Amino acid sequence: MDKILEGLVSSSHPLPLKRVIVRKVVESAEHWLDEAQCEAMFDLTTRLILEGQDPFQRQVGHQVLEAYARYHRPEFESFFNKTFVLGLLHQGYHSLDRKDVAILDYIHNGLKLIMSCPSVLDLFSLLQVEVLRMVCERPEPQLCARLSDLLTDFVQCIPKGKLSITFCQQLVRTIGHFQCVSTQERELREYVSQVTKVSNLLQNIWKAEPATLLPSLQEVFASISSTDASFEPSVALASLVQHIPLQMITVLIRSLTTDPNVKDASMTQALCRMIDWLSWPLAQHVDTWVIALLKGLAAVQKFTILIDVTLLKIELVFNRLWFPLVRPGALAVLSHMLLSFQHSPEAFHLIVPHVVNLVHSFKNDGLPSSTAFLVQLTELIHCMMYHYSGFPDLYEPILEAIKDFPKPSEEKIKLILNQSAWTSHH
Ligand SMILES: [Cl-]
């Protein structure tokens, strides 16, 4: 039947005919077949899965392989052996390079098929070694996501003991290299979902083996605090930090800011990188980290860092307000920056030219959540215009745009502005 299936898939027969023939091929599995017959079908179906020209061909490969492996499990066990699996990982397959996602997908599928077979134990042991190698090699997000699906299904493939920590550290470093060169929106949604899978794997490892958590977070800190000019860590690291307990954030921020061996440059970088985490499409709780660090730095009087980074980043933070999921966090960061930067209008005047367009865009969108957001923003803006008064031409269009929102009392504004300032000239 392998010759028949082969002929069929390269034919131009109508689709319903192709399907009835494939059905008969699938049913052919339920017969006594010798070893050569089984191996010939496993070769062909593997070729169709990995090199099938279209979705139909690959699907047929999957259907036929499943049936043949189900009815001829010992022959599939001989076929899907350690040497073959290792070969796929190191040399790829026909036209496919070893890093192709289809390869890792086929291996995952194969593990499901041989999971009741004795050979599976040595495959797991083999894979624990190979998957650690794979993550050390800095794989692309799509491959790393597939790896994550595999390891979620088969936890026996995750490196164990001391190597579980090494694996997590290397996976953090790997995440730090993630990028998406495409600017097509479809690719970008896929990138984010891929990164989410990898992050989910790692969070699951933290739960299962708590000793991996701290070393993993330390690695995140080493990445973001790096002053290596040739490397910029990916904002994909933000996907890791959304569900870290508060106490743990405190330990990390405290160590970063009070350890006498940490250079000012490293702190500046950590703060710049954390603010950039606001760029991550699912950056809901980044503000918790950024504000902890802003406060941590003020406590050890790193006011020049605070001031310089604010001037560098405040436009980015303001622009994040356009993204509804990150907006409350971006507002919290913006508010802390503006209300702490009390010696010069420079930071506020960087955002001034963007206020009308934002306000105009949200005030008639019909959303009560937009209105409540604007009540908070306009309160903040009124405080800044009062504190940095004497620019009537600059402020007039803003005052017009915000005329229909509450204006805090002068008395309330003065109390708001009693916020701790960052000491200039320090
Ligand atoms: Cl004024």
Swiss-Prot record:
Belongs to the peptidase C19 family. Deubiquitinating enzyme that plays a role in various cellular processes, including DNA repair, cell cycle regulation, and immune response. Plays a role in the inhibition of type I interferon signaling by mediating the 'Lys-33' to 'Lys-48' ubiquitination transition of TBK1 leading to its degradation. Cleaves the ubiquitin chain from the histone demethylase LSD1/KDM1A and prevents it from degradation by the 26S proteasome, thus maintaining LSD1 protein level in cells. Plays a role in the DNA damage response by regulating the deacetylase activity of HDAC1. The keyword Nucleus applies. Its main location: cytoplasm. It is found in: Cytoplasm; Nucleus. Signal peptide: none annotated. One of its GO terms (molecular function) is cysteine-type deubiquitinase activity. This is Ubiquitin carboxyl-terminal hydrolase 38. Interacts with isoform 1 of FBXW7; this interaction prevents FBXW7-mediated degradation of MYC. Highly expressed in skeletal muscle. Expressed in adrenal gland. GO terms for biological process: negative regulation of innate immune response; negative regulation of proteasomal ubiquitin-dependent protein catabolic process; protein K33-linked deubiquitination; regulation of protein stability; ubiquitin-dependent protein catabolic process. Keywords: Cytoplasm, Hydrolase, Nucleus, Protease, Thiol protease, Ubl conjugation pathway. One of its GO terms (cellular component) is cytosol.
